[PDB]
Amino acid sequence: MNIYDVLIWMALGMTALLIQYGIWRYLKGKGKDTIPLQICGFLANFFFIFALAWGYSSFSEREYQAIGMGFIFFGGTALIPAIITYRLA
Amino acid sequence: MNIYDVLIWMALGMTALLIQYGIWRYLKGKGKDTIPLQICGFLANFFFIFALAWGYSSFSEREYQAIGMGFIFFGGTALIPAIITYRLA
Amino acid sequence: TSEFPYKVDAKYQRYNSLKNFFEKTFDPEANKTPIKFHYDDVSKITGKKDTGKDLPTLNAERLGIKGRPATHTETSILFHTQHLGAMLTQRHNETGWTGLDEALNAGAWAVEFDYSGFNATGGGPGSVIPLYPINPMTNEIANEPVMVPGLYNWDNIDVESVRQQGQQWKFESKEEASKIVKKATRLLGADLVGIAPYDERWTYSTWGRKIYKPCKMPNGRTKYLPWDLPKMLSGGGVEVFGHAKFEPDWEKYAGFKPKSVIVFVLEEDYEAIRTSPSVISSATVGKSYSNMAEVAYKIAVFLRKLGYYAAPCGNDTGISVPMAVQAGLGEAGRNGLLITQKFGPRHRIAKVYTDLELAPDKPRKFGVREFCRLCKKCADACPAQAISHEKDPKVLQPEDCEVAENPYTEKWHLDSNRCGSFWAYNGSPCSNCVAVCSWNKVETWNHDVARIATQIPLLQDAARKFDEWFGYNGPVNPDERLESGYVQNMVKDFWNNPESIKQ
Amino acid sequence: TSEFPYKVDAKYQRYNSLKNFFEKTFDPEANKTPIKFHYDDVSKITGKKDTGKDLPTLNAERLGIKGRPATHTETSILFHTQHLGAMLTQRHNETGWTGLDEALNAGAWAVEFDYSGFNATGGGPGSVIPLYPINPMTNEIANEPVMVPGLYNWDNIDVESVRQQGQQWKFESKEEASKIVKKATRLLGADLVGIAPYDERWTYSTWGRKIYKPCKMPNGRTKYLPWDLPKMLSGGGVEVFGHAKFEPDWEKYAGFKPKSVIVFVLEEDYEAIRTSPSVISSATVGKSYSNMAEVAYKIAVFLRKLGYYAAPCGNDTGISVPMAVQAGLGEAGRNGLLITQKFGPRHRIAKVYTDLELAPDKPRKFGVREFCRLCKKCADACPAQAISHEKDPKVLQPEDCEVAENPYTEKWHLDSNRCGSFWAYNGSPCSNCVAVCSWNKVETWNHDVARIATQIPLLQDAARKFDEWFGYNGPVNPDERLESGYVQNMVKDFWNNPESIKQ
Ligand code: SF4
Ligand code: SF4
Ligand code: SF4
Ligand code: SF4
């Protein structure tokens, strides 16, 4: 609802699509564009977008410490697939 | 909110990004990739996404005649820039 | 900026509350002459057939009277009897008026009926309710009720004690006082809240209370009513008893002279107002009158415990629509109703007077009055054709109003005798002018986007025409609203939908 | 599936309502012995210092009594006096307990105090309120009140008339009856509604009404109270007067034998419960008791106008938590409270008994009881350490409960004397066990995703620990909740935030 919620959600979807396209382009450039190497990047992108969305929602709910803790946890959960993908490429 | 609203908004943003990328790729393929020819396509894509979003919102509000009427109006308002872009390319 | 946005003439006078449709019901002089309309036929003005010109005759036929139109008192009493449940509606064997829907309407109106003194049709200062004494030892209810204060009581006995004990709360500034009062009002149940300075222009020039006489009901309990129900049922006619009149002396009846007013509104259900002619929209209007009565008492108690005087009011002491405008809650539309930004006209207004000095709010402008000059949508949807069809608002004159309207303010004229004639015909409040309003929308992203388009020059007409075309809130035409099946299907969906409409 | 999900022993007996903390307040035998705890010290069980062991002595010191702990009656009367406003809270010169917050709390509990008969502490069948007679002619309020039915009246005089006139509404099936009743209940104001069959196990074995004696107040008005306030203020001690006991005979006092029950809940404010120890959470609990009293009356009137018997109830006739479980509204948590999916424990439960045959709902399971076996979060946050620290629920035995608890049901044991001792110490209800609950969340997308994760095997522990770590609803520790400044800052933000928390 609101007028800013829908814009932020569309922006988050666009950012997720951009990150997925960038991951696929990176894999194709390095030549290792296999599906698992892309599913790992998809998981990383999903967890990063989840971190951002949870931070926004916690800001809406006036729960301000959850914004940073959610960032930390979901960012690490996203960095692990990113680290795996980078080490495999 | 809900659990379906945010997913549909993310999907709509992703679809808008895909349509914009397709328009830009089409313009580059035909060679006429100027900014106005891309702003017109952006307006068409924006109005199409607005049509879809208004239809979904009207479905949520149990106003079912608005779904088709808004589809028709915003679809024509999107088709006009599409027609202009096609005639200019 | 400025105290009042709209233009008030220098001949303005405070309105007498006893002159309104619901209080002039019980003036015995109103029973001597048939009800009067400002225009006998509005067919020429609208270009459509006038359906409300025959309402007095149909009401008189319903009452059993042949050869003359129903009077103002008779019409109002017919509506009162149908609403109270002592009679059956003309459409009781129809979806939307059945015994189930009537039971829902009666349940929703319960708190307003039995604990607010039925304040919808006005009230004296403080509200009085009849309650039957009960015996705690044996749980036996007596037969003769006693008069006790209702939910709108003006009892300010402890304020002086609070002040003398030193526990009166002191605010550092008026701005903080307004902030705290608005936050407290929102917590206690209000949907919107605004603070306006005490303007005597919006206080009635005479306060009155209906005169009730005991009449025995067949269940064995005596009930106090302002008219003779047993005589009316027996066919002996309609009889009223008058009013007890009070001068508007704040010090005598409240104990203080007001210096600020707290105005708040409560939203009505979207899915029930859509079925506007039926008694489901009546149920959602009764629930709102119950809710506004419950919230006002809490606000008054909060103010009195703060150490400041308070007088909770509902539809009885001042005119709410001009005060809500002055408190910055919205704008007055073509229908004469406050058009809030969030809810449109889906709301009911209540007020609380207090002597606490609060920082007043300022009137707001967001495009209602310019939209209303072109839409003319509520006027088309009136089954009684009461609302004016004129394009522009004007400074109303005595020639432009009846005895029941306060002239000398810049606005559109509404005929009150037609809106009461149609409620007598229908047996329930009608809400069609609220249901079909373009601002009667839920709070979502698309409606917030459209509200911006109502003030962008080129997008205004597009938004208006799209509101008309998209079919929000059903057909505009009053007759078509029924035999097209929209009301019936909407009531059936309402009963068969587990949840309401919020998004 | 099945009538009741949890395991009920074959020795189960109906609970006596007069044995509870709020009803046993006014038994004169409760004033002879100091209040009793099941465990004198819970330091060993919790591993933390027991702060509630000194509550009786502190309450006795507050009452002016030296050398002995406060009694059950004395402790309860001290809370009653602090809540009523005749005394000052121990923290009145602190943010969250000031005169402004006390005024807000008093305003919110106004309807419950003056029109429900103060039903939060129980009540008899029908509810009785004292109201001062008023003179409509002069607006002169008398000094001696009269006893009249409250918002929970059991007056069923017109049901027989409706049935004999043939206007009783006939449903084609029980499923349609349940659908219509649930839709009507949701419209009238309920947040969730469920229908359960009449189970006599959840009805109290004895109904009682407190005995009130007149006492003169310094304002000049006589007020009816169950204890001697003027003697208590003068230092002469606390005196109570007993109970009027009624057998639970439905036909005698209601007129019908029940066959179905309508159970509904009303949500509480999220931003006010967050400041749980302060009187803002008390205000949001008084508003909920007002709202539940207003809604129950409307539902009862709706049922009676349908032609069926109805008995609206609040905290007086049966046990609401087991009945709401039977209606499929949620699960009983570690705290003993109904844990709804949408609101968690932020709600208040009211019930309406009726003879109409409705299709009953089924109990629901969505992972509350398995979460509670591991979280143990409400137990840590109890300032009185009342909630049990045991891992698993068990079939409670007479050795595992005091006189005030109903044994023989599979559940966790709560100490009621500690939760009343801390309310006497604080001067307001505490809601800490509701505030810190992991299910106490607003309904949004992320919280629904987390609720899905409370039942996926690997994600359960992650969701629990993340709820604990993310800091929702403030610190768990009761002492830390105050001197860390969280309550003070939250109250200041509440006063300085124009809008509440809804998303
Ligand atoms: S309520 Fe409105 S629409 Fe209905 S008759 Fe009265 S003025 Fe007309
Ligand atoms: S229907 Fe149109 S003219 Fe009437 S009040 Fe609403 S916006 Fe104004
Ligand atoms: S209300 Fe809950 S947290 Fe507070 S003392 Fe009672 S049981 Fe403990
Ligand atoms: S705090 Fe934890 S254990 Fe206690 S009721 Fe809530 S979920 Fe259950």
Author numbering:
A (entry chain D), B (entry chain C): 1 to 89
C (entry chain B), D (entry chain A): 49 to 551
Give the exact sentences the study uses for this entry.
Unexpectedly, electron density for two menaquinone molecules was also observed, each at the interface between PceA and PceB subunits. In our structure, the catalytic site is 8.3 Å apart from the proximal FeS cluster, that is 9.9 Å away from the distal FeS cluster, which in turn is aligned with the menaquinol hydroxyl groups with distances shorter than 12 Å. This organisation forms a conductive redox path between the menaquinol pool and the active site. In contrast, we think that these residues, together with conserved residues in PceA (H495, D515, Y520), could be involved in the transfer of protons from the MKH2 oxidation to the P-side of the membrane.
The major players in this process are respiratory reductive dehalogenases, corrinoid enzymes that use organohalides as substrates and contribute to energy conservation. The active site of RDases has a cobalt corrinoid cofactor that mediates halogen elimination or substitution, and two additional iron-sulphur (FeS) clusters for intramolecular electron transfer. Here, we show the structure of a menaquinol:organohalide oxidoreductase (MOOR) complex isolated from D. hafniense strain TCE1 as a dimer of heterodimers (PceA2B2).
